[PDB]
């Protein structure tokens, strides 16, 4: 597989009511960007190659249920993919909302210029408040993850350096 390592036992989050057949369990190193993207990636479980589309809005230790993929038959069994985000973090998904650190120079902070902040969809350009403060969260709405309230928003933790 691409990101999926292989089948394991006691993968993570042992308390998910499912199976109803054969439980397939597997862990995979996931990129932060792929936690956002949630597209079709190849899984290799017991020599079975399928294209699995895990849902956007996934995190470190997040257990993903894909029905029909575990128990191959009429009683649908699922595959619990416990993803393992890279030792590189930047974006904290809290439910539907984001927190990512924004380090701006003091010249831009005081004039209230614009800084390109890296996000999991690409580049966003945040216009910092004129004479902004370090420790603030710059709310870029419609730049969060999916959820109950539609799409969330990004809180940029300003560092006037």
From Swiss-Prot:
Gene Ontology CC terms, in alphabetical order: cytoplasm
Compartmental location: Cytoplasm
UniProt function note: Does not influence ATP binding or hydrolysis nor ADP release. Exerts influence on the interaction of DnaK with substrates; in the presence of DafA, DnaJ inhibits substrate binding, and substrate already bound to DnaK is displaced by DnaJ and DafA.
Protein name per its UniProtKB record: Chaperone protein DnaJ 2
Subunit structure comment from the entry: Forms a heterononamer with DnaJ and DafA in the resting state. Three copies of each protein are present in the complex.
Protein family according to the UniProt entry: Belongs to the DnaJ family.
Gene Ontology biological process terms in this record: chaperone cofactor-dependent protein refolding; DNA replication; protein refolding
An MF annotation (GO) of this entry: unfolded protein binding
Lineage: Bacteria, Thermotogati, Deinococcota, Deinococci, Thermales
UniProt keyword terms in alphabetical order: Chaperone, Cytoplasm, DNA replication, Stress response
